[PDB]
Design a protein around this ligand. Structure first.
Ligand SMILES: NC(=O)c1cc([N+](=O)[O-])c(N2CCC(N)CC2)cc1NCc1cnc(N)nc1
Length: 294
């Protein structure tokens, strides 16, 4: 990559290292990602290349896909900060509600766009939601989970987080619907409000039981077909459902209503991104600018 001048390391992703770099010919500043492999499957190349046309203001733009010397490089639009770092930096006082609302509204717009084109993300987390000084937030890595799969550990052996994984995935479902992304965004929404992760599991069963302890152990009444799922066991403990007023205080009733619909157990009934954009919670939405010291 002598076409790019490395400025500095941004971090370590799931599949490889990420660098901030400058296009020596156009002066463009970008994010360069190296991806895991005896030559890279051809099926993955075709799938990823189609993503170059999935353009929207709330989706991080894929500039180029380069396969050479059996290595894979993805060139992306560059943004200065990610939501995980912003949340940590905002721990003492918390992110103001008008900004939490603006970010959720924008994220739902990005999901509605991708979902209308039959593309899901499958592994949303604060670390892949990027922000700028203008008040915008964008979703990164849409479509990569399908092409490469989601591993148990990263290329550096770090544990891939389970905190935002939908229950149907944990129970062994073979086919994923767009509902899996709505679940993840709901968990992220709750974390911005309370300043603590909603379901911080440290194993697949710990993650599932934390969900059950808060929302109640699911049954055929709320989730038709749950007892027939691949990893369901009749021996699961039976916990009672808790009140949202206790789960996400001090969020108002419009906010609690919307979150409850984003965390519905049955994937077929969970609210869609398009329907969520019309929820009363967004009646007074605005576009504030965050305080960023770069
Ligand atoms: N497209 C991008 O500009 C971008 C891409 C990735 N990525 O390709 O993953 C990324 N992460 C790397 C792996 C980390 N575990 C999570 C965040 C961060 C980005 N930008 C925000 C940012 C810029 N600079 C610094 N120092 N920190 C954050």
């Amino acid at each position: 990559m002598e076409n790019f001048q490395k400025v500095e390391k941004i971090g370590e992703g799931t599949y490889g290292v990420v660098y901030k770099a400058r296009n020596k010919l156009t002066g463009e500043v970008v994010a360069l990602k190296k991806i895991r492999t005896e030559g890279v499957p051809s099926t993955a190349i075709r799938e990823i290349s189609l993503l170059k046309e999935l353009n929207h203001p709330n989706i991080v733009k894929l500039l180029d896909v380069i396969h050479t010397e059996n290595k894979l490089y993805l060139v992306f639009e560059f943004l200065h900060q990610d939501l995980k770092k912003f949340m940590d930096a905002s721990a003492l006082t918390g992110i103001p509600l008008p900004l939490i609302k603006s970010y959720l509204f924008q994220l739902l717009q990005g999901l509605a766009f991708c979902h209308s084109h039959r593309v899901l993300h499958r592994d949303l987390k604060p670390q892949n939601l990027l922000i700028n000084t203008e008040g915008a937030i964008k979703l990164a890595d849409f479509g990569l989970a399908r092409a490469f799969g989601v591993p148990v550990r990263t290329y550096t052996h770090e544990v891939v987080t389970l905190w935002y994984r939908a229950p149907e995935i944990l129970l062994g479902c073979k086919y994923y619907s767009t509902a899996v992304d709505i679940w993840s965004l709901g968990c992220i929404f709750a974390e911005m409000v309370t300043r603590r992760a909603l379901f911080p599991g440290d194993s697949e069963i710990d993650q599932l039981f934390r969900i059950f302890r808060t929302l109640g152990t699911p049954d055929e009444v709320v989730w038709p077909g749950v007892t027939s799922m691949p990893d369901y066991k009749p021996s699961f403990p039976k916990w009672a459902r808790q009140d949202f007023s206790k789960v996400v205080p001090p969020l108002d009733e419009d906010g609690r209503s919307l979150l409850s619909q984003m965390l519905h157990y049955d994937p077929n009934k969970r609210i869609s991104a398009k329907a969520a954009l019309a929820h009363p919670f967004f009646q007074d939405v605005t576009k504030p600018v965050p305080h960023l010291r770069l």
